């Protein structure tokens, strides 16, 4: 139970990198960047692939400016507390068509006519926070727990949690403001980066469904 | 003999990363970014620190938006051929003042009122290429070899070469167009990235001195 899906079509903002962790694990890192018509809103997301798949991807030798499709999951990480959500994939696929690129001052590029979709299903972790813009537009910050099963070194089942933050606007905010900790919910939207004082990767919701309690 | 110096004052364009090579060597990577009044011309340069110094720097926990001073060298690398020049440092130092930052669409930042200086001294590797813009401004592409001594694992002296490309404009181009392979030369200028069809880190010369042959 619980869903965790991200689909991106974007340009590699610059050449990806293959490196290693302190433990010797391969990590392939690329920034995928786009803007979708939904104003033209830009996004840039770091995508990581780990282990042998990282080496396999690196071998494909994709470069900055290449358009890719990526299927991935949102990965929550926590350290000393501070936290971040990033996109994890197993592979990307290069598009056969040549994207229309927009160059930024850093020499980074993004793809016009991109795609950015998230589908997550989990449970609310805490009573949500409702606020209003000065003009009276509702905004609700909602945090959900997405549970992942995995097998450790011993072959015993373990659980991992990803805490995913979502931003709901206007009617979506008003409709979901009565959600409570523990309530199951499904959220569809786009993956965005929201700046604060700090960075936060969030889901800007386009559709939300409270699930049967 | 031979000089290889880069001085940068800029903002970290985003959070730096500590990673490792396939051989387990620590590599600290940061992008330092600025624009200097000399129009306001932006630059973004990847700076690398290797080994224990990389770990030491990572411990300082500098973040995107922090202003730094970096003293470094230009490092030439070659693979299968293709090549790149990057900035190598042993440490950066954070400024005590808060920079005026300019944000790009990628969420990257650069520092206004930055500093970017290169001093190199080596020998011309090949007869230089002179071209003219349509309006008749001279441009000379000049490549020099900068020789570095080092000790290998056995304690024997070895040499390493860095091939550095420079762009000379107008009077500087006309003045230096008679340079020949082997001629010693000193070049001062700013480190830039020049796009082509590909990326090239080059020295845009502000002063050049032919040395006694």
B157: tokens are 């002296």
Q: Measuring CA to CA, which residue among A142, A122, A124, A140 is closest to residue A132?
A: A140
Of B83, B102, B121, the position where a domain reaches its end is: B102
Nearest-Cα distance to chain B for A179, in Å, is: 32
Distance CA B205, CA B192 (A): 10
User: What's CA B64's distance to the chain center, in Å?
Assistant: 20
Place of tokens 């960047």: A33
Breaks (C-N over 2.5 A) in chain A follow: 38, 80, 197
Q: Which of residues 74-133 of A touch B (CB under 8 A)?
A: 102, 104-108, 110
List beta partners, residue A69: A9, A93
Residues A13 and A72 in one domain: yes
Whether B44 sits inside 8 A of A107 (CB atoms) is: yes
Residues B212 and B119 in one domain: yes
A142: tokens are 């909602």
Residue in B with minimal Cα distance to A23: B24
Residues B77 and B134 in one domain: no
Residues of A in contact with B195 (CB under 8 A): 107
Distance CA A163, CA A182 (A): 13
Phi/psi for A178 (5° steps) reads -90, 5
Q: Measuring CA to CA, which residue among A1, A10, A54 is closest to residue A29?
A: A54
Residues A137 and A193 in one domain: yes
Q: Could you tell me if B52 lies within 8 Å of chain A, comparing CB atoms?
A: no
Residues B86 and B115 in one domain: no
Please spell the DSSP secondary structure of B22-66, one letter per residue. TTS-EEEEEEEEEEEE--EEEEEEEEEEESHHHHHHHHT---TT-
Residues A115 and A212 in one domain: yes
Distance CA B187, CA B122 (A): 9
State the residue range of the domain holding A93. Answer: 1-102
Distance CA A37, CA B196 (A): 30
Three-class SS state of B89: strand
Whether A33 sits inside 8 A of B110 (CB atoms) is: no
Whether A105 sits inside 8 A of B27 (CB atoms) is: no
Which of A20, A107, A110 lies closest to B21 in CB terms?
A20
B145: tokens are 């070899």
HEC per residue, B91-153: EEEECCCCCCEEECCCCCEEEECCEEEEEEEEEECCCCEEEECCCCCEEEEEEEEEEEEEECC
Q: Could you tell me which residues come within 8 angstroms of residue B96 by beta carbon, excluding any fewer than 6 positions away?
A: none
User: What's CA A6's distance to the chain center, in Å?
Assistant: 6
Residues of A in contact with B44 (CB under 8 A): 105-107
Distance CA A187, CA B206 (A): 56
CA angle B74, B78, B84 (to 5 degrees): 45
Distance CA A68, CA A88 (A): 15
Residues B194 and B116 in one domain: yes
User: What's CA A102's distance to the chain center, in Å?
Assistant: 22
Three-class SS state of B156: coil
Distance CA B47, CA B100 (A): 21
Residues of B in contact with A193 (CB under 8 A): 107
Whether A19 sits inside 8 A of B19 (CB atoms) is: yes
Whether A31 sits inside 8 A of B106 (CB atoms) is: yes
Residues A141 and A196 in one domain: yes
Residues of A in contact with B104 (CB under 8 A): 104-106, 108
Which of A22, A102, A107 lies closest to B20 in CB terms?
A22
B186: tokens are 């000193």
Q: How far is CA B139 from CA A75, A175, B132, B177, B182, in A?
A: 50, 64, 6, 9, 20
Q: To one decimal place, what's the resolution in Å? A: 1.8
Instruction: Check if the beta carbon of residue B71 is closer than 8 Å to that of residue A73.
Output: no
The CB-side HSE value for A204 (13 A sphere, CA atoms) comes to: 12
Residues B59 and B98 in one domain: yes
User: What's CA A107's distance to the chain center, in Å?
Assistant: 23
- CA-CA-CA-CA torsion sign (A10, A16, A19, A25): positive
Domains contained in chain A, number:
2
Which CATH number fits the domain that encloses residue B126? 2.40.50.140
For the purposes of burial, counting CB atoms within 10 Å of the CB of B162, is it exposed (0-12), middle (13-18) or buried (19 or more)? Answer: buried
Residues B129 and B143 in one domain: yes
Of A102, A124, A151, the position where a domain reaches its end is: A102
Three-class SS state of B180: coil
Residue in A with minimal Cα distance to B195: A107
Q: Obtained via which technique?
A: X-ray
Q: Measuring CA to CA, which residue among B87, B67, B63, B69 is closest to residue B14?
A: B63
User: What's CA B148's distance to the chain center, in Å?
Assistant: 16
Query: How many interface pairs between A and B have CB atoms less than 8 angstroms apart?
Result: 58
Could you report how far apart the first and last alpha carbons of chain B are, in Å?
14
Phi/psi for A208 (5° steps) reads -135, 140
Residues A9 and A65 in one domain: yes
Q: Measuring CA to CA, which residue among A107, A61, A44 is closest to residue B31?
A: A107
Of A49, A71, A102, the position where a domain reaches its end is: A102
- CA-CA-CA-CA torsion sign (A117, A50, B55, B52): negative
Residues A128 and A37 in one domain: no
Please spell the DSSP secondary structure of chain A, one letter per residue. --EEEEEEEEEESS--EEEE-TTS-EEEEEEEEEEEE--EEEEEEEEEEESHHHHHHHHT---TT-EEEEEEEEEEEEE--EEEEEEEEEEEEE-SSPPPEEE-TTS-EEEET-EEEEEEEEEE-S--EEEE-TT--EEEEEEEEEEEEEE-TTS-EEEEEEEEEEEEETHHHHHHTT--TT-EEEEEEEEEEEE---EEEEEEEEEEEEPP-
Q: Could you tell me which residues come within 8 angstroms of residue A34 by beta carbon, excluding any fewer than 6 positions away?
A: A8, A9, A10, A11, A42, A43, A110, A111, A112, A113, A114, A115, A116
- CA-CA-CA-CA torsion sign (B144, B145, B148, B152): positive
- Mutate which of A41, A42, A46, A106 to disrupt the B interface (most B C-beta within 10 Å)? A106
Q: What radius of gyration, in Å, describes the C-alpha atoms of chain A? A: 18
Which of A17, A19, A44 lies closest to B106 in CB terms?
A44
Q: Could you tell me which residues come within 8 angstroms of residue B30 by beta carbon, excluding any fewer than 6 positions away?
A: B12, B16, B17, B46, B47, B62, B68, B92
The CB-side HSE value for A194 (13 A sphere, CA atoms) comes to: 12
Q: Could you tell me if B202 lies within 8 Å of chain A, comparing CB atoms?
A: no
Nearest-Cα distance to chain B for A12, in Å, is: 12
């Amino acid at each position: 139970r619980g869903m965790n899906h991200v689909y991106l079509i974007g340009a590699l903002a610059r050449d990806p990198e293959l490196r290693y962790t302190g433990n010797g694990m391969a990590v392939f890192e690329a920034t995928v960047a786009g803007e979708d018509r939904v104003r033209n809103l830009p996004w840039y997301h770091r995508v990581s692939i780990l282990g042998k798949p990282a080496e396999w991807q690196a071998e494909r030798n994709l470069k900055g400016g290449d358009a890719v499709v990526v299927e991935g999951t949102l990965e929550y990480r926590q350290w000393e507390k501070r936290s971040a959500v990033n996109v994890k994939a197993l592979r990307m696929e290069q598009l056969g068509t040549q994207p229309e690129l927009i160059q930024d001052a850093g020499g980074g590029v993004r793809m016009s006519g991109a795609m950015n979709e998230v589908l997550v299903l989990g449970n609310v972790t805490r009573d949500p926070e409702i606020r209003y813009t000065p003009a009276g537009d509702a905004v609700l910050s909602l945090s959900i727990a997405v549970n992942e099963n995995y097998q450790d070194r011993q072959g015993q089942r373990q659980e991992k949690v990803h805490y995913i933050d979502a931003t709901l606007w206007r009617d979506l905010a008003e409709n979901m403001k009565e959600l409570r900790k523990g309530d199951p919910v499904m959220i569809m939207g786009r993956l965005v980066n929201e700046g604060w004082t700090r960075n936060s990767t969030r889901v800007e919701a386009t559709r939300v469904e409270a699930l049967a309690r």
